[PDB]
RNA sequence: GGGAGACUGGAAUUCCUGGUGUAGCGGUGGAAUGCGCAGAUAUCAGGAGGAACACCGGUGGCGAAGGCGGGUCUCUGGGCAGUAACUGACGCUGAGGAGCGAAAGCGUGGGGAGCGAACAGGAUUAGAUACCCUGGUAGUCCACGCCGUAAACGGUGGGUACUAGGUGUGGGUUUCCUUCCUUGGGAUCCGUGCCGUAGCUAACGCAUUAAGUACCCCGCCUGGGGAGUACGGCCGCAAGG
């Protein structure tokens, strides 16, 4: 396949971060994620993980011959600019960064707290 | 703190139909800001927050675009 | 409405009975009942068949419409619903413009006065027939057709309902009563909403003669029966049976669907019970 | 709520003259008016608890009112009661 | 015999020339039973906020009716009942 | 101001309690 | 955001159907039970169902106290200011009595997305019947009846008249620099915060919204335990009060 205009959805939870490259239409082309990169437990959390998953999904992306990408971020901070960075240096260019985070309305009801 | 533009007999009518109006006094997030930074009485905010959130339901302005 | 009885004497203690304030009259059109005698539980050999079952009450069939592919395209007014004792759901009378009467099983939440529309691309309004083709994804039916021109057969006990799925190529998939999901081809007919009376569950008799009358007979216990009429007979006293539980012909339980058949290779999943 | 129209009506039918409004006549008139209304409404609507609590105030309004005219007067106060079909 | 503000949207398949009759056909009903005036404007053919009912589309009609309340809750049950309405609302122009 | 007889009298509460809930059935017997 | 009834609005979680798609996903201070290679997570489209309404929204408003906020329509209670036309002491309190009364709990019948007593496993500890993790039945919801209890706290009963100021804030009338736009300034009535004299208090503190100087009425206390327990009685299907 070829498809020069893709996309590059990105979230980021408190203990794992993965990261997959898709059309403009919603497929998926290829993703990579601290599991595959080779990481176990706590170690998935850091951000050097995200960093190798981010490398990992451009030079997959860019075998199928991926050039522009808009990223889609989500989730508590974690990786986010050491992904973004990664992403650049991985030989890509992007054309917007969007945050869209889940903000439910007061719907459902927490899980209680922790002690 | 900054002048109610409303209180004046000169301000204009407050209404679901003015979308500069009501697109004003609302954050490009979609969202509305405080008395605080905008300035206006009670009576005032209260009529621009309903008048916006019926104009939101009436599908004039996005949910948070 | 569900109507319970005072306690006056210690048989009727506890008993209830269903309030019909849906009925509104109790004589079928005499040119629709045809006559039934009770079979008695034997076949034609005259032996039994099923244990516990026979003796009961007098009585009358009653024609019902299952194919509804004859009128199509003709408007029908509702005029009464009536009671009918062969099947747990009322039966409802319909009267339709060019003159014909039929009887057809009552959906949940219709009412006297009212117009069902039957054709091919008829409204959603309950009681409707179409063929799943033209039925919109995600609404409730029943007595659903398991092929095409093969009748109503399915969902017709009180409170049943089926859920339509999405669609897919030539096939429809259907939520069963039961969690099961089957695939149906699109060509058969259905029939919006829910059949009503669902007040069945809560009916409490109270009165051995309550289920005399609708004709069940005693059962009888394994573990007091004779160890020759029995596999579970004998016994100095009362015992367990000292063996597994078994059917009284020697087959124990678990399987009982015969594998390979035609449907076998090709319908989803099975029931799962109290998940 | 009364309006002015049946308010004035009301005032005019049973006031001593033409211009008390204050009268212990048109006190009571008023109030059971009101209380005729009130509870037709709460014939249809059962769980307005603070409606009931607006029952009870006019109720003892009413009666407290009631008391000072028999203190009063006798006549008066059994030709209130006749007219106004009440029972006490 | 209230003052009373109701905006409808319409479908844009429908063309701009038949809405009005439409509108005057819907309002006889009200027109015939409390003897009352309204005042119709009409402006439309505007892009939505987010999509609706899989329309991105609409038209926008404004109508002023001095009527009953039973007779304007008549006329939102028989706009609501048409299909080729997507939204109605119904609001009262004085204090209250 | 304190704490000790809140605490003093939720322990006598507590001790009544529990000694009902486990005499209950003979409670039960002896009263009807 | 005083209450009730009807209609209706979008986000979010879960589930299901259908494409893209490869081996992981979830989890804690660190790890394991768990879900997947019969196709998970992620991603796009569509559908079903239940509960609650971010930004406005605050030491702000309303209600006698519990409490009250997605929009539209219908019915409805209370309060405040002014003119002062009317009644002409009709005012306050209230033993017994009646009504309302957070959450949990009980009976009958529905609904059940998320959360989650009881109960299973996983982990730590010498022992975990717990804090931590993966599951989950009552219940949380609706209609009709019940029981009437909380640190139901301002730990401060109800009414009335008097006693230096200052500074925010909500509502309504008035007059003057006067643009007459105006937190420009002044007067007046009601509500709600903070700092302060005379006074009171053992001290902490209260201080025109008194714990001050005064009058009317009701409830309550006389050392800590025993005990808000025993007996009797009333209420309640039961828990129990
Ligand atoms: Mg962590
Ligand atoms: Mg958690
Ligand atoms: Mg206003
Ligand atoms: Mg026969
Ligand atoms: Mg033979
Ligand atoms: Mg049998
Ligand atoms: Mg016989
Ligand atoms: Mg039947
Ligand atoms: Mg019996
Ligand atoms: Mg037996
Ligand atoms: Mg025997
Ligand atoms: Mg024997
Ligand atoms: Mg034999
Ligand atoms: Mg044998
Ligand atoms: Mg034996
Ligand atoms: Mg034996
Ligand atoms: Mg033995
Ligand atoms: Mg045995
Ligand atoms: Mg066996
Ligand atoms: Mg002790
Ligand atoms: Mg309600
Ligand atoms: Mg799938
Ligand atoms: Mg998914
Ligand atoms: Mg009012
Ligand atoms: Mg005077
Ligand atoms: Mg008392
Ligand atoms: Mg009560
Ligand atoms: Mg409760
Ligand atoms: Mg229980
Ligand atoms: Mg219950
Ligand atoms: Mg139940
Ligand atoms: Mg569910
Ligand atoms: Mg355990
Ligand atoms: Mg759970
Ligand atoms: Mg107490
Ligand atoms: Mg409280
Ligand atoms: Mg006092
Ligand atoms: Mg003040
Ligand atoms: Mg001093
Ligand atoms: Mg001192
Ligand atoms: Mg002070
Ligand atoms: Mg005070
Ligand atoms: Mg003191
Ligand atoms: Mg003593
Ligand atoms: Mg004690
Ligand atoms: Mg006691
Ligand atoms: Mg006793
Ligand atoms: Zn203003």
């Known amino acids: 396949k070829n498809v020069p205009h893709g996309a590059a959805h990105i979230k980021s939870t408190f203990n794992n971060t993965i990261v997959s490259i898709t059309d403009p239409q919603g497929n998926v082309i290829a993703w990579a994620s601290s599991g595959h990169v080779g990481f176990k437990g706590s170690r998935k959390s850091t951000p050097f993980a995200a960093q190798l998953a981010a490398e990992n999904a451009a030079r997959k992306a860019q075998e199928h011959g991926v050039k522009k990408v808009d990223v889609f971020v989500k989730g508590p901070g974690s990786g986010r600019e050491t992904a973004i960075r990664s992403l650049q240096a991985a030989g890509l260019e992007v054309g917007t960064i969007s945050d869209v985070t889940p903000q439910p309305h007061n719907g459902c009801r927490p899980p209680k707290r922790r002690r | ?65 | 409405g569900i109507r319970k009885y005072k306690p006056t004497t210690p048989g009727r203690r506890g008993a209830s009975v269903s309030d019909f304030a849906e009925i509104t009259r109790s004589t079928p059109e005499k040119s629709l009942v045809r006559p039934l005698h009770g079979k008695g539980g034997r076949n034609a050999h005259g032996r039994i068949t099923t244990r516990h079952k026979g003796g009961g009450h007098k009585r009358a069939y009653r024609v019902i419409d299952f194919r509804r592919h004859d009128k199509d395209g003709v408007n029908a007014k509702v005029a009464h619903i009536e009671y009918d004792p062969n099947r747990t759901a009322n039966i409802a009378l319909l009267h339709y413009l060019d003159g014909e009467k039929r009887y057809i099983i009552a959906p949940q939440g219709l009412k006297q006065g009212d117009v069902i529309e039957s054709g091919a691309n008829a409204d959603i309004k309950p009681g409707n027939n179409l063929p799943l083709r033209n039925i919109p994804a995600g609404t409730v039916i029943h007595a659903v057709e398991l092929r095409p021109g093969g009748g109503a057969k399915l969902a017709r006990s009180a409170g049943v309902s089926i859920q339509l799925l999405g669609k897919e190529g030539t096939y429809a998939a259907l939520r069963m009563p039961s969690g099961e999901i089957r695939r149906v081809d699109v060509r058969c007919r259905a029939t919006v909403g829910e059949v009503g009376n669902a007040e069945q569950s809560n009916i409490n008799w109270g009165k051995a003669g309550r289920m005399r009358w609708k004709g069940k007979r005693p059962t009888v216990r394994g573990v007091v029966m004779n160890p020759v009429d029995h596999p579970h007979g004998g016994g100095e006293g009362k015992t367990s049976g000292g063996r597994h539980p078994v059917s009284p012909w020697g087959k124990p339980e678990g399987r009982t669907r015969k594998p390979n058949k035609p449907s076998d290779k090709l319908i989803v999943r099975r029931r799962r019970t109290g998940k | 709520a009364l309006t002015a129209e049946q308010k004035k009506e009301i005032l005019g039918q049973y006031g001593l003259h033409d211009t008390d409004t204050g009268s212990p006549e048109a006190q009571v008139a008023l109030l059971t008016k009101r209380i005729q209304d009130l509870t037709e409404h709460l014939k249809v609507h059962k769980h307005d608890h603070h409606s009931r609590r607006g029952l009870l105030l006019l109720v003892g309004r009413r009666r407290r009112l009631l008391k000072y005219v028999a203190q009063v007067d006798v006549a008066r106060y059994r030709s209130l009661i006749e007219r106004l079909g009440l029972r006490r | 015999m209230r003052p009373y503000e109701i905006m409808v949207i319409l479908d844009p398949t429908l063309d701009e020339r038949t809405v009005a009759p439409s509108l005057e056909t819907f309002l006889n009903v009200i027109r015939k039973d409390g003897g009352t005036v309204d005042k119709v404007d009409i402006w439309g053919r505007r892009r939505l906020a987010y999509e609706i009912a899989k329309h991105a589309e609409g038209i926008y009609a404004v109508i002023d009716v001095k009527a009953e309340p039973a007779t304007v809750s008549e006329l939102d049950r028989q706009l609501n009942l048409n299909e080729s309405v997507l939204r109605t609302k119904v609001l009262r122009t004085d204090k209250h | 101001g304190s704490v000790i007889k809140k605490r003093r009298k939720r322990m006598s509460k507590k001790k009544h309690r529990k000694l009902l809930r486990r005499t209950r059935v003979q409670r039960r017997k002896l009263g009807k």
């Open chain 2, 1 to 65: 703190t900054r002048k109610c533009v409303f209180c004046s007999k000169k301000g204009q009518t407050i209404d679901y139909k003015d979308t500069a109006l009501l697109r004003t006094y609302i954050s490009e997030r979609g969202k509305i800001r405080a008395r605080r930074v905008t300035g206006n009485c009670v009576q005032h905010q209260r009529d621009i927050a309903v008048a916006v959130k019926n104009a939101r339901e009436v599908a004039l302005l996005p949910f948070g675009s």
